[PDB]
Structure formats: structure tokens, C-alpha cells
Design a protein around this ligand. Structure first.
Ligand code: FZW
Length: 277
């Protein structure tokens, strides 16, 4: 009953080409899939996996089959009847959003950046409504297609993402859609800075200390006032005071549909001073 919304793929339809990462008990590959070839990513469960690993692997496939949304990575199908077992998803030539933005610094309009955030928020609203808590929302877990559409994914830990994680999730392991909202605020900051490292060189302990003392990330350069205000509200210490994803999607949609609203920029706090006549 775990694989209700998933298609079973026969192994003869799949060609693993090059290793692109590490799974939990198997490699992740780039490959080709032939139905109706399309490029795919392929996570495998290799010989020797434990019962817990099998349960988690097939459960992941099952949950992924349930999702059908423009801003969630699409499951092509699963190989469960043969070994090794596989989870097969679409593949994005542009890759993960964090590396993408870092390699394309300054190349997009404010409206393009905000549109990426609206899509991420819409995907997160869907997950939260489906009662799925992501727990690792970060630009590193978002794929970008050739139309600039962002697809929320989960590639596993890179490393504990302290600086993306809400205080209550760090302090007492309370992961909810409201802690995902905190993470989404960090993702907003990553996007508007073209992939800067949150909190720069602060250590994990220094970040938590700063947050507990009330400090928050400063505005990115060239950032719409409305966008900075929204990310700041995602970082409220009190979980219940944060916007829900429905609120975030609504605001971002309204800002995009009235784009003059994005012309008012938050003041950027200069780190250096250059004196010239
Ligand atoms: C194969 C696979 C299996 C599962 C997932 C995945 O996102 N699972 C997942 C689990 C829980 C929740 C969600 C959710 F959708 F976010 F909600 C997704 C994604 C993929 N696809 C994938 N695409 C890609 C990829 C890379 C470059 C371009 N296009 C796709 N990479 C990787 C990858 C890289 C490094 C380590 N582990 C997995 N994975």
C-alpha cells in the first residue's frame, strides 16, 4: 500500500550513466529513462540494505508519488520488484538553486527572483497542507528548471543545517510547518543575495547565540522593502507569530501582480565606507 501513487518502472527502461551524489545506502546517478529518452536522477538501494533502510526508501517513494504540484520535484517512478531498488525523478540541467545563483550572480531581475520565491512558497504551502514537514528546506534542496521554475526536493543532509533551522527545532526537536517557515525566510535571503552564506563566517554556536540575543540577518543589497519585511516576520522567535505558508504565498502573489510594490528598496547597511570628491 506504500506505492499507491507511483508507477513501477521496468529496469530495461533505465540507464545509469554517471554518479552525481551519495544516497543513504546506494549511489545517486544521472541517467536516461525510456517510456512513452528523458534525463533522470536515480537513487538506488544496494545489496545489504537493512529492513529500516528498505522501509524508509519505499516510504520516501510512496510519499513522493503522493505529491503532484508545479513546485515539487516529480517522481517518474520506482523500481521495487527488482534489485537494486530505485527512485527515479526528473532531472534539471540548471541543477540546485544555491549553486545556480552563485554562478549567475546579478543576472536576474528583482521580479524574476521574487517569482522564484513565490514558487518555492507555493510548493511549501502544498507540503504543509499535505501534513508533510520538510525539516531541511534550503536552496541546496531546490532544483531550477529551464523555465526558472523552482522545485522543492530533499537530497538528504549535505551536516546539520543549524543556520536554516528554527530555534525550537534546534532546542527541543520541534519540527513543524512553522519551523519550515523560518527556513523559508533563510531561503528568501539566499535568493536575494544570489546564494550568500547565511551569517557569513559565524560558527554554528555564534549563530544560535546571535538569534537568541535578538539579532537577525541584515537586508540584502537591492532588496525590496516588502521582501525584507516578509523574511523578518518568518524569523519571529515565537512560533505562533510567524506567517503560515498561505499568508506567504498570498503576499508574494500580490507583490508580483502589482510590481511597482517591489520598487521601494530597504536601506542597505554599508560595511565599508569609500570617501570620494
Ligand atoms: C533521485 C531522487 C530521489 C529523491 C528525491 C527527493 O527529492 N526526495 C524527497 C523526499 C522527501 C520529500 C521531498 C519533497 F518533495 F521535497 F517533499 C522529496 C530527489 C531525487 N532526485 C535527485 N535529483 C538530483 C538532481 C541533481 C542535478 C540535477 N537534477 C536533479 N540530485 C539528487 C541527489 C543529489 C545528491 C544526493 N542525493 C540526491 N536527487
Amino acid at each position: 500500500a506504500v506505492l499507491k501513487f507511483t508507477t513501477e518502472i521496468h529496469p530495461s527502461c533505465v540507464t545509469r550513466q554517471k554518479v552525481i551524489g551519495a544516497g543513504e545506502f546506494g549511489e545517486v546517478y544521472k541517467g536516461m529513462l525510456k517510456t512513452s529518452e528523458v534525463p533522470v536522477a536515480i537513487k538506488t538501494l544496494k545489496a545489504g540494505y537493512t529492513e529500516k533502510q528498505r522501509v524508509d526508501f519505499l516510504g520516501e517513494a510512496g510519499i513522493m508519488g503522493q505529491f503532484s504540484h508545479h513546485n515539487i520535484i516529480r517522481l517518474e517512478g520506482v523500481i521495487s520488484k527488482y534489485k537494486p531498488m530505485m527512485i527515479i525523478t526528473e532531472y534539471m540541467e540548471n541543477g540546485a538553486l544555491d549553486k545556480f545563483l552563485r554562478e549567475k550572480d546579478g543576472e536576474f531581475s528583482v521580479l524574476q527572483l521574487v517569482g522564484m520565491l513565490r514558487g518555492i512558497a507555493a510548493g511549501m504551502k502544498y507540503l504543509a497542507n499535505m501534513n508533510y514537514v520538510h525539516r531541511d528546506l534550503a536552496a541546496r534542496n531546490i532544483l531550477v528548471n529551464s523555465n526558472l521554475v523552482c522545485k522543492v526536493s530533499d537530497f538528504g543532509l549535505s551536516k546539520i543545517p543549524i543556520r536554516w533551522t528554527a530555534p525550537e527545532a534546534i532546542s527541543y526537536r520541534k519540527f513543524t510547518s512553522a519551523s519550515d517557515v523560518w527556513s523559508f525566510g533563510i531561503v528568501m535571503w539566499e535568493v536575494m543575495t544570489y546564494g550568500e552564506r547565511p551569517y557569513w563566517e559565524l560558527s554554528n554556536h555564534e549563530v544560535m547565540k546571535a538569534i537568541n540575543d535578538g539579532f537577525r540577518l541584515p537586508t540584502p543589497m537591492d532588496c525590496p522593502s516588502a521582501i525584507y519585511q516578509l523574511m523578518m516576520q518568518c524569523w519571529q522567535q515565537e512560533r505562533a507569530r510567524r506567517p503560515k505558508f498561505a499568508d506567504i504565498v498570498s503576499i508574494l502573489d500580490k507583490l508580483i501582480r502589482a510590481p511597482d510594490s517591489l520598487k521601494t528598496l530597504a536601506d542597505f547597511d554599508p560595511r565599508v565606507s569609500i570617501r570620494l570628491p
